[PDB]
Symmetry: C3
Subunit: 369 residues, 3 copies
Amino acid sequence: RNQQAMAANLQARQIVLQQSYPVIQQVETQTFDPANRSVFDVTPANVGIVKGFLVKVTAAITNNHATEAVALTDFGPANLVQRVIYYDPDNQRHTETSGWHLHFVNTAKQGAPFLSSMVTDSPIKYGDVMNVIDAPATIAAGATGELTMYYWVPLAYSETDLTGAVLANVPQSKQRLKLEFANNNTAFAAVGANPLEAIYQGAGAADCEFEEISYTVYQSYLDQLPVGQNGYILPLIDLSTLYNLENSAQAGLTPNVDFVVQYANLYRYLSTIAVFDNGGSFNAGTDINYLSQRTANFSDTRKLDPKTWAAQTRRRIATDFPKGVYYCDNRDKPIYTLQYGNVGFVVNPKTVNQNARLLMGYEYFTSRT
Amino acid sequence: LRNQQAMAANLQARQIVLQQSYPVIQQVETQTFDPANRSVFDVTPANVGIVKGFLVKVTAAITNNHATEAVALTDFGPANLVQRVIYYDPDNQRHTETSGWHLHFVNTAKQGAPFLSSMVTDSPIKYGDVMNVIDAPATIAAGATGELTMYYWVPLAYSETDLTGAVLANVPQSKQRLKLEFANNNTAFAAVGANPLEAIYQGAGAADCEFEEISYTVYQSYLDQLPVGQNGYILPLIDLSTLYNLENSAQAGLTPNVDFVVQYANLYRYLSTIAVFDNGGSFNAGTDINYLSQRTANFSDTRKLDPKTWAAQTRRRIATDFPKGVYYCDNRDKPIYTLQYGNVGFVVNPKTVNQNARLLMGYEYFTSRT
Amino acid sequence: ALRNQQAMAANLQARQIVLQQSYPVIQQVETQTFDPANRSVFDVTPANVGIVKGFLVKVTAAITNNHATEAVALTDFGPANLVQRVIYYDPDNQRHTETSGWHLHFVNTAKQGAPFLSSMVTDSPIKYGDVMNVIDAPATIAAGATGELTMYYWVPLAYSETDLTGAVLANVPQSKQRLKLEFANNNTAFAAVGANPLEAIYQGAGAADCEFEEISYTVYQSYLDQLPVGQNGYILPLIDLSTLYNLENSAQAGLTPNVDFVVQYANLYRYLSTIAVFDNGGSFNAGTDINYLSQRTANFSDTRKLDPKTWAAQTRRRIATDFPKGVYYCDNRDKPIYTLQYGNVGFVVNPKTVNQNARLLMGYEYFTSRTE
């Protein structure tokens, strides 16, 4: 009766939260040289209800150029991880997206730059003491810089909403977290080249290289699951729902013409990110007339100029996302059609360079079956 | 007990309209003008359902034509691009009628931080002031031209989840009216020694400063596709019959070491109070005040506090201090309501009182349109 | 029996009724200006009225560096060390909080979710900012200069504005409360180069000739007035008012490199949060002297065994920044440490390097019954 089942799921959820034992433990650590390999498979533990994975990444970058330096790109350390893919025990894929998109969602969900240290007038020495997410603004010719990055790969939606979580007990569990890290070919961009996927860009890029990269994965899950008269108490709707992040690329933009990216049906899109990679140039709204979301049945529900669009985002993350990165929150009322494309994301560009494209990022809920 | 019946129903209807209707925000009007020609505009919004509020974008290009002197932002700066804002619902009933700076301070108070500001952090990823949503050059040098961007949210509804104060705009031949009085070459620039209260820039070059142009764009936020029940549209009749307004006033007659009391009228439920101590054109960081308070006829004093402790209370509210001479008081959980707590007043016992000292009061309150 | 669940519901309702019917009040209790060289310990006598929730203590000071050439600079804790210790006793003379100024301040911060009463920096052109200098102190005081400081502390009884657990009913005349404050003096506030800066406010080569010109405080008492009275009398949340919410701190020594240092939770208490300061022989490091930290139970638990940076990450989610160097925080608010719920539990720190006189200063925040 729907109402019945949901009432049941929410109760089981609260019981699990009340009774279960929350755990966060290291699953794997490794150090390597991107020259030899940059793709890895992490095999998590199959215990209780898995909520997500915290991925710590550290790296040492050396600028072996004789005289030219390099400087952080807009995404910087967020590109330490190129991509991520998660397969659950039943071999069903959840998240499959880029590291930068995953990072922007982590920020969006936190309500501020993910794991950042806010600046205040406090005389007591709070501040960037621990360099949790950190990277030198520039790496001079001959210097070696150290970076630290953190990503949260979510299964469950949040700490108190287990929608998307994974019950890990399935024997012959095909559960695996795949990570592709940056390498000497993706991390550094030459002057004039596209900085989208790079970590550093500058005149000394050609001679920049990784001294090494290291990662540590922590798995977060709930143990000591509650058991009722009928057995283990579990929110069946939560555990049978997928909460994923995915990315896609779109091209074919033309000045002053509405570029529309349709949302697929069945998916409940919680948020949308659109990056205007204007042929390797990323501008602060100046190459756009407006953005919007619209149902080709009731016009636009939010056709806004770039700054006003940015204003809404400032209400969500207390600052702006990097240049050319646009965010759209639909958490309270997810974009959910039924007919592929009853709703679309719109960008009417003011100027379009050669090789322009929109790099899309989505956050959504969907049923396993 | 009929009241307990009405409220319960109003709440239910609110929940239903929120769940059933879909949020919409669309541009209603945009214009570029020279404030030398005109500065007052009457914007006619569309009557398309339940209106929650208006987001007003304002931009401007200001040139300092002075041969040698510069000008610097006043404490309120771009918040003074709009001098006054007045809203009239379809029934020509007035809701908000306040100054741009007061409206802006309330936007800040409601957000829990400087309105639409970009917080500074240690993040290496390039977040930050990328889009300059609310922006203005700290100074405008002689011969230079500066650009500014400002935003104001004119509320009807109290919030996104509490439709108290929202307006049902569906009355044909009787639309709403959003009156905007903008800054001009007379109000925006204060000479050295002049009162900067309403100015944007002040300095030795003020006399030669002028707007090149000002532009504004009004966005209307409303709820469309209202839910219709077994008996017509289901609506929270109490929310829609309540006025949520911002208003301001001025008070004079302060004496050193004597309690200056400003009575709160009766019938109104005051959610917040702002008091600006315009000390004869001087705005001080609490040093010209002995203490502030909110007291009842019983000479109680539920909040008699020294300036810094009062400010501490505000820091818990918006994570920082309001500009110099601006004092905030939050009464959102237990609104000041005389005749249900007795007569109440806002108190300021000044330490120093210059010539032409006055207290500019800003109020945020609820009241029945009947 | 379900008699407890019934008692809890009844308590909660009384709390709701009290929060809705009574009116919150904050009023000055007393102000005093003095030279810590003359006196530094004060017993404040709060007024007995309604339900007391806590005290906001404002502290200001003027410090003069009279060295001939050397200046001094704020230590990591700085003005948080203006008050060395705070102790509260209710009307029945039952002791509640008893802790250092720095621990209390760090808890104030944790509860706020940001540096206590700080002013956040933003790009806003409107002149918001550090206007009123609520908590403030000059980064340095040059030789011959005089600096001014302002500090605030919230001494809680009640857990929060909405949770009256730990509050105090003060309607017993001839039975006064007691708020003892021990302030910093010329001995505790200044640390010489190389000395331990833990409890100091300023440290530097000019420390020997630094002295307070004066210190001043103002205690404000926060309470609920006009308590609701019903058929059977005053409606009161009996469990809230008979529960103690306290902060305390202790020191622990005996750390060895690469060996797990375990501080057992001498429970029976419901530990809401834990702060561990790694005073590594007078030097405070940004996690570089620690292999990992964690909380573990009887078994081989390790509910959260983490390297320093990841441990710091959890805290960044809590207070939007890091606590000062060598200060580690652990939030257990939703599921308090209670060793009777899962055997003994301990806070663990496996040090990478241990200097001479190394120790862990533990700060606890907890609930406990006036009668257990």
